[PDB]
Write a protein that binds this DNA or RNA. Structure first.
Ligand SMILES: NCCOCCOCCOCCC(=O)O
Ligand SMILES: [Ca+2]
Ligand SMILES: [Ca+2]
Ligand SMILES: [Ca+2]
Ligand SMILES: [Ca+2]
Length: 757
DNA sequence: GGACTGCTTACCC
DNA sequence: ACGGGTAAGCAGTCC
């Protein structure tokens, strides 16, 4: 299996290394046969020799086109001939672009921003993480004595925790009499031991939880301040702290640095992404957090460091266990997108998509269109019409059925051949004209995207057939990851079309996909309500909730199943309505906000406060209980009581602090905000105390008692103490518990005052 | 001082 | 990172 590709510079020329693992041994296959290329559309072939003269200096050296070649490719299908120009070293490719492009002869340059190492993986037709070889992994973690908003790394590391198949251990330089702790004499000593341990183990994967943004970065500032060669890489190198967008990411050349945090953050939904939280999520089992004030007083005291040791050891043990659980599917994704586990782990779907298309586009002799420059985002700023969202028949309904289109937007993209290279072409025999946008789509050749999108679904069903056959239950998991991922990639394509930053942007395509959607859902709804006696209680972009008012569950079921057999043959192409759910009763509140209880009893909840991270756990727990009341049982009494108790409990300051925490995200840099929400108010103050309030940072806070603007009383959850700081019982009763509860209890004509306290 | 209006977050699909 | 459609609430800005 190819772990990753990278290139060095031996004797001047670039050598592409293809880091692999065959027959239980890590190998580094070198390659100098590959040479970098770029593309350009010249108006006259005569100018090529004039353009070959173009020069540009990189550092001390002067650099010009090492070779040149007329290449016959395609572009949005249409055959185009263009000049592919080589270069000695890949780093010359980005020096000579602006000049070679500006040229008054040439119209444009193409494929000029594809990292060599990644170019080589695409072109050579190699796919990472193919074939079944066990890869050794090593989780690691650090405990720091971080002072009150001091410089990053100006505190020393107290412990380094590591865990793998066989053991968890702590390396530390204060004395702890425990079997899983190794005391070195000094900080430098315990790092040098850690570094040794990694070497002696020689793991393929290094698992961290936010290693990208803290653990590795901190180890550097230390190894810097202490003069220790921080050599973790197999080549003997130290880690490269590459800067991806808003944050950074760390690469250990020769090892897969698997930072779980971005994966966990992408995959699981939680209010807070503490390693303690995600263990309790993924595995159900609990985890104590030893806090900084706790660690430092243990260091300073020498009293009760054994807890801090248990914490370090647990931190690593849980990192490993999360790694061994998440790496598998993150590896299937390495293979599907055909780039390194590393890149894939940290990438947007936007990029994962573009990486797939570039690979397919090269294989398909298609000159990939260029990312849009600053000015070419500004024009793309115009939006388009989305999905149909019916205003719900509000209130409590019985015997409901969820009907939805199986893979709607892909079915449309497949069916109507919706693709930039099929959009309003000259003289196709047959054409498909989108319902309102109007745009005609050629129907004579399988369009680039529809082509690949079919292959994807084509395979996904193959993989689900191989699944029912699979004896080995591991493979059946690794198989299910492959199919589940393909579904997500396939469902990402419509999005990519509407994405201004997307190479294959096509507002014409996205708009047409959504247009068709609106047509098809409203036609089902119309058909379902007219032909069959159903009322549609609510609907939203490919999904419908419906009943036959005053009919038994038995009948609703039969008639819905009957309606599918009616409509489905009337629907065109891959477009197919499915019966997905039946629900004893259901409660539709506003658009995006409803709950339903199934026959077995499982209440499902959408959009309501209960499932929002930016609402107090007392708001949600209260709403969740008033909702159980109306749905699971019938007791609107039982409900109004659950409300009344929940309020008096808050009014009598008996409500736990923990349940009063409000989690919202700072989205951008604190200066850019036009308005100051309590969370910005709170985040702004924490920046006057030199805290790291950057994009993605979740602000937790409690509204303290008083009057005026809510943000002036908002103080962080950590910082809140019960002694001498009461919570705002008024706000918490009047602005959270009551408003949410009222939403559900409003349908039974209860005044907010009526809920009282 | 009550109602409009914009800002911001997170959800649904 | 990121598709559009939507419910909300906080906190100004009218008139
Ligand atoms: N994220 C895309 C916006 O949602 C549009 C709806 O797509 C859902 C695709 O159906 C899959 C479920 C099924 O097979 O019934
Ligand atoms: Ca549902
Ligand atoms: Ca289905
Ligand atoms: Ca998207
Ligand atoms: Ca958007």
């Amino acid at each position: 299996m190819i772990l990753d590709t990278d290139y060095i510079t031996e004797n001047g020329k670039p050598v592409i290394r293809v880091f692999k693992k065959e027959n239980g041994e890590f190998k580094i296959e070198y390659d100098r046969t590959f040479e970098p290329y770029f593309y350009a559309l010249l108006k006259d072939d005569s100018a090529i020799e004039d353009v070959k003269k173009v020069t540009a200096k990189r550092h001390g050296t002067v650099v010009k086109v090492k070779r040149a070649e007329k290449v016959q490719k395609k572009f949005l299908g249409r055959p185009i001939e263009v000049w592919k120009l080589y270069f000695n070293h890949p780093q010359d490719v980005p020096a000579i672009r602006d000049r070679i492009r500006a040229h008054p002869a040439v119209v444009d340059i193409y494929e000029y921003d594809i990292p060599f190492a990644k170019r080589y993986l695409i072109d050579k037709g190699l796919i990472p993480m193919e074939g079944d070889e066990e890869l050794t992994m090593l989780a690691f973690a650090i405990a720091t004595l971080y002072h009150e908003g001091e410089e990053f790394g100006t505190g020393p590391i107290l412990m380094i925790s590591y865990a793998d198949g066989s053991e968890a251990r702590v390396i530390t330089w204060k004395k702890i009499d425990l079997p899983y702790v190794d005391v070195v004499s000094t900080e430098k000593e315990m790092i040098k031991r850690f570094l040794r341990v990694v070497r002696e183990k020689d793991p393929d994967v290094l698992i961290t939880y936010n290693g990208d943004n803290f653990d590795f970065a901190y180890l550097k500032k230390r190894c810097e301040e202490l003069g220790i060669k921080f050599t973790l890489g197999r080549d003997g190198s130290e880690p490269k702290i590459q800067r991806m967008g808003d944050r950074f990411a760390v690469e250990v050349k020769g090892r897969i640095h698997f930072d779980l945090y971005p994966v966990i953050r992408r995959t699981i939904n939680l209010p807070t992404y503490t390693l303690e939280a995600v263990y309790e999520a993924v595995f159900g089992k609990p985890k104590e957090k030893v806090y900084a004030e706790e660690i430092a007083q243990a260091w300073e005291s020498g009293e009760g460091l054994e807890r801090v040791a248990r914490y370090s050891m647990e931190d690593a043990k849980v990192t490993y266990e999360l790694g061994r659980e998440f790496f598998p599917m993150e590896a299937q994704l390495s293979r599907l997108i055909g780039q390194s586990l590393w890149d894939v782990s940290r990438s947007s779907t936007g990029n994962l998509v573009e990486w797939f298309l570039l690979r397919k586009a090269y294989k398909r002799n298609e000159l990939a269109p260029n990312k849009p420059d600053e000015r070419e985002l500004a024009r793309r700023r115009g939006g388009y019409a989305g999905g149909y969202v019916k205003e719900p028949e509000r209130g409590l309904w019985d015997n409901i059925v969820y009907l939805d289109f199986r893979s709607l937007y892909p079915s449309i993209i497949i069916t109507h051949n919706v693709s930039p290279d099929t959009l309003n072409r000259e003289g196709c025999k047959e054409y498909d004209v989108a319902p309102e946008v109007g745009h005609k789509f050629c129907k004579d050749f399988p369009g680039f995207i529809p082509s690949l999108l079919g292959d994807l679904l084509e395979e996904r069903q193959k993989i689900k057939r191989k699944m029912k056959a699979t004896v080995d239950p591991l493979e059946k998991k690794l198989l299910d990851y492959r199919q589940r991922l393909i579904k997500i990639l396939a469902n990402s394509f419509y999005g990519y079309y509407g994405y201004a930053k997307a190479r294959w942007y096509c507002k014409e395509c996205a708009e047409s996909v959504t247009a068709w959607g609106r047509e098809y859902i409203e036609m089902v709804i119309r058909e379902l309500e007219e032909k069959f006696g159903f009322k549609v209680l609510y609907a939203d972009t490919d999904g419908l909730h419906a009943t036959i008012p005053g009919a038994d569950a038995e009948t609703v079921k039969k008639k819905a199943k009957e309606f599918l057999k009616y409509i489905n043959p009337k629907l065109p192409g891959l477009l197919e309505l499915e019966y997905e759910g039946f629900y004893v009763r259901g409660f539709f509140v506003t658009k995006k906000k409803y709950a339903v209880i199934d026959e077995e009893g499982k209440i499902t909840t959408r959009g309501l406060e209960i499932v929002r991270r930016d609402w107090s756990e007392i708001a949600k727990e209260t709403q969740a209980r008033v909702l159980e009341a109306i749905l699971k049982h019938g007791d609107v009494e039982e409900a109004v009581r659950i409300v009344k108790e929940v309020t008096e409990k808050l009014s009598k300051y008996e409500v736990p602090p923990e349940k009063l925490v409000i989690h919202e995200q700072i989205t951008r840099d604190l200066r850019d905000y036009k308005a100051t929400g309590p969370h910005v108010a709170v985040a702004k103050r924490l920046a006057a105390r030199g805290v790291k309030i950057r994009p993605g940072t979740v602000i937790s806070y409690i509204v303290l008692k008083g009057s005026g603007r809510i943000g002036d009383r908002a103080i962080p959850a950590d910082e809140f103490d019960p002694t001498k700081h009461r919570y705002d019982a008024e706000y918490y009763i009047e602005n959270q518990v009551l408003p949410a509860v009222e939403r559900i209890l409003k349908a039974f004509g209860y005044r907010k005052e009526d809920l009282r306290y």
